[PDB]
Structure 1
């Protein structure tokens, strides 16, 4: 039995046997000791898969042994056969499946939860490969920052995301929706009881899935620093955090991104005192997180030094506080190692990243369905906290989010093309190949001004198109390539028609306009080829009809709100329109 697709990619995986079939009922050893959340996740799986737990041990049944390094379970030590989570970093685990026994040992509880996650990905129709795995993340915090503008996620969207994060070993969710005044416009005041159950449902869902629910506060709207409105407003900040602490919040983020009010020393004072009086006082609270007013390299540095704010902020903030930045720009092609080194150097600490992809709020007509791209594979040298800013489109965000889980857990081995393919395969099953056709055309984000990021759209198709123009302007035979391109354009329309018919409403409601748009472009792309063949056949009537169709298909794509494949399927039409074979 083969190893299924896994996400994230485990650090170490060795195929050690032929694989075995899990029995209809199993022996469960260790559930009394092992991490509750981890056991609950196992039980949920076993139920959904029709695998019963024996009330009494039967040596003919499959044995599943679960626990932590701390625990003393001899059945665990036996089944692991020398493999252990003892030497592993936090969230690490060991997984051994060999000859009727599956053994999960976490370095800690989060770790046993993640082991279960790998187990659930390993098992297909009762069959499991025989493997030994030791696994642990590259980066210590890995998650989503809910920082996009436009229509907020629904409550159900959120619950589903949290469960999705847990399944793919993402441990951070920074909560900050624009339709929640208690994070900004009413930052001072605690949640009323009418909003309590909703917030409780998020806190509990997060805790169950080993996701740190980070509560992001943006006081900058109207926060006062100076004098006694300032001792007032700082105490309001404590009051709020205390009312959230009582609900179960153990992680906090304070934003200075939108304030116009701009004093590094004042922002950092609030942060430091909050840190001493709250986060250190509670003992229970994770390191404080902040977003400075200058949060991209262009805004932070000028002329080979930091700008005023950044120098003062870096000098004043406690070393234990987590500082976010977006890379070399707000939305940018890359975070090269050199940029992380620079910023990390200025702050004399490991940085946190806020990565603005797949967010599309700055160019909402296009969907960002690409992988993590442009992020240095050695980034962990200067960064120990990684978040992505997703789209308002929760369901379709899962594709790039899937790749972020792999990038941040197994950075050194991250392969953007393979990770992209794995995301669509795992998310879309039988609809995967059709989803690839469409999503391949919608990875590159570019608002034509300040914001651009992402793998280029449909690169292989781009290259074939370029080859066509090259052959045709070189008096070379392009017969076979013309045939091949007709096939690609027909395949584009076919895949989109399939997705329209078979995608669930939850995806379809996010992408239906972009599906129609790629159909229109595929049809304009076909017409474009018809122009070429017409010229080759010296059929002016066929040329003129195809030209009129191609121009129409281009014009509708340009007018529509939806945007896709600008540099490829769209641009090909304009290229064909302007091309004239008779001059070669």
Structure 2
């Protein structure tokens, strides 16, 4: 009857009935014409939900019909009842569930696979609402770049991530882990046979999930440009790219982010020649991706104009090349429309975004657990390619990555708070509410210098703390608010204890120190209220006791590796410690 949480939000969805229960066995129509990856995804779903396939038809049992628009299948047409994927953009699809029948029509193969993923999300306990849906992405390339420093994702993390992207309609995965010598330290060298199977597994998994596996080369460590050596090194770049092509790689990136020979003309020459001699020569390779040595607005621009390097790079690099930038800074609050317009103007095309959130390599004590935040909802005007750099913490990165999927697939309707709530609801099931209490305190990233991004920590509790100080300093009665805040702090502690006892090991292993840290702070916040109450009661012994406890809790948090809620739970203790009620 009711529509389950969906992610991404589909473009068009209307409830057209009251839904029905899918029978224990079903009629499968189109299984041989439809996209193989979509059909394999469907079969895996039905198999896991104990829904058998009928070898012969039966008007009683539910009928599921699947295929592309370019297929002449009139059963699909009949089931679709007008609505079609014919005029939708790439990766788009139509889905109709109406009395005992579900029709999935992709605009293409990719689109068909996405139709299935939505279907999977619509079904609960063999029940499905009945709706009419047409859907397609706001932006063409949506995904993740594995560009963080620190402990690398394991082979199993990547495989799991790859499936998670497919399931959320993310179509891009840029493979450039700092731990793989063949992306950088041995960039010339083709993969040895002893590495071939691992790579093949990533390449295959990506393909079966409609994910573009982008191989990222950073030749900057030692590439040469001039004379015979430059020629040799260029040929090695070709050599390497085709050994990868022979494994099935069809997307490439070349990074100039870390080179010291800051020569714009030479960087772009290598890109242009690679583009001619490889990308275009092959015909089925996707547009070349690049990161220029200047890759954030502050490094790219002075006074509304490009700097020397960026001016030359933008003038030299072929228009068919995806150029990545990070926004106004490497790690920064926002990408407002005006920033995208500026950089897009300079490069005379739609840009690619490398968004350093929720990555935490620069401030590892803190987990980044908030939604996409600060990215203008009109960005698609100037951006055709959107990626996020995640944490070394693969599992917990799913919260933020989940909201990125929504932002990039349905940008105009993206609401960061509802997206954030939905991500945790869909990922954490019965522990969703407790996870929210904890994660609410861990959204803001800030290394106290050059790197800051994210939604503020626990903003509503922050507003309440502010009101307590106003009331106390204005001689107004705060007894009801003090009471409310004790409730807030007890609830922080309780939720974190719950998460400790009940979280899956795969999540708990990423966040146990931060859980303890939040508990410590909740206990200090409580002791801080005790100080205020002692001063209102003029009780010197109760004050001194609360004060030593509050101070100890704060000292524990400060010296601990884990970091959380700095401006809210932690700062509150310092505010209370410096507050002297006797002065008014």
Q: TM-score surpassing 0.5?
A: yes
Task: Give me the whole-angstrom Cα distance separating, in 2, the residues matched to 1:44 and 1:72.
Answer: 26
Distance 1:244 1:464 in 2: 56
- In structure 1, the residue corresponding to 2:412 is in which secondary structure? helix
- Contiguous gaps of at least 5 residues in structure 1: none
> Matched residues in 1 for 2:53 and 2:329: separation?
53
Structure 1: distance between partners of 2:127 and 2:225? 62
Q: Deviations over 1:462-485 (max 9, x none)?
A: 000001101111111111111110
Tell me the CA shift for residue 434 of structure 1.
Answer: 0.3
Q: What residue in structure 2 maps to residue 496 of structure 1?
A: 496
2:260 & 2:373 partners in 1: Cα distance?
A: 32
Q: Deviations over 1:33-53 (max 9, x none)?
A: 000000000000000000000
Please, what TM-score do these two structures have when normalized by structure 1? 1.00
Partner deviation per Cα, 1:540-570 (whole Å, 9 max, x = no partner): 0000000000000000000000000000000
Alignment RMSD: 0.4
Shift of 1:305: 1.2
CA distance, structure 2, for counterparts of residue 301 and residue 545 of structure 1:
56
CA distance in 2, matches of 1:477, 1:157: 53
Aligned 8 A contact 2:184 2:219 in 1? yes
SS of residue matched to 1:413: coil
- Could you report, residue by residue, the CA deviation over 1:172-196 in whole angstroms, capped at 9, with x for unpaired residues? 0000111100000000000001000
Structure 2: distance between partners of 1:489 and 1:68? 54
Deviation string, structure 1 residues 226-246 (Cα, Å, up to 9, x no partner): 010011000000000000000
- Deviations along 1:293-316, one digit per CA (max 9) or x if unpaired, are 000000001122101110100000
1:504 Cα offset (Å): 1.1
Distance 1:22 1:477 in 2: 59
Moved beyond 2 Å, runs of 4+:
none
Cα distance in 2, alignment partners of residues 341 and 366 from structure 1: 32
Alpha-carbon deviation of 1:580? 1.1
Deviations for 1:196-246, whole angstroms, at most 9, x for unmatched residues?
000000000000000000000000000000010011000000000000000
Post-superposition CA distance 1:310-333 (Å, at most 9, x none): 010000000000000000000000
C-alpha separation between the residues in 1 aligned to 2:583 and 2:47? Answer: 70
Checking the alignment, whether the CA contact within 8 Å between 2:91 and 2:106 is kept in structure 1 is: yes
Q: Deviations over 1:406-425 (max 9, x none)?
A: 00000000000000000000
Where do 5+ consecutive residues of structure 2 fail to align?
A: none
Q: Are 2:531 and 2:576, in contact at CA under 8 Å, matched by a contact in 1? A: yes
**SS of equivalent to 1:88:** coil
Q: Which residue of structure 1 aligns with residue 517 of structure 2?
A: 517
* Partner SS, residue 384 of structure 1: strand
Alignment map for 1:15-164 (pairs within 5 Å): 15-164=15-164
Query: Deviation at 1:509?
Result: 1.0
Query: C-alpha separation between the residues in 1 aligned to 2:32 and 2:304?
Result: 58
Counterpart of 1:411 in 2: which secondary structure? coil
How many angstroms does 1:20 deviate by? 0.4
C-alpha distance after superposition, 1:455-510 (max 9, x if no partner): 00000000000011011111111111111100110000000001111111111111
1:323-368 Cα shifts (integer Å, max 9, x gaps): 0000000000000000000000000000000000000000000000
CA–CA separation in structure 2 for the residues paired with 1:169 and 1:160: 14
Q: In structure 2, what is the Cα distance between the partners aligned to 1:575 and 1:115?
A: 52
8 Å CA contact 2:360–2:366 kept in 1: the answer is yes
Matches within 5 A, 1:356-367: 356-367=356-367
SS in 1 for 2:63: strand
* Cα deviation digits, residues 83-103 of structure 1 (max 9, x gap): 000000000000000010000
Q: 3-state DSSP class of the match of 2:2?
A: coil
1:571 paired to 2:571: yes
* 2:304–2:342 Cα contact (<8 Å) kept: no
Partners of 2:488 and 2:20 lie apart in 1 by: 41
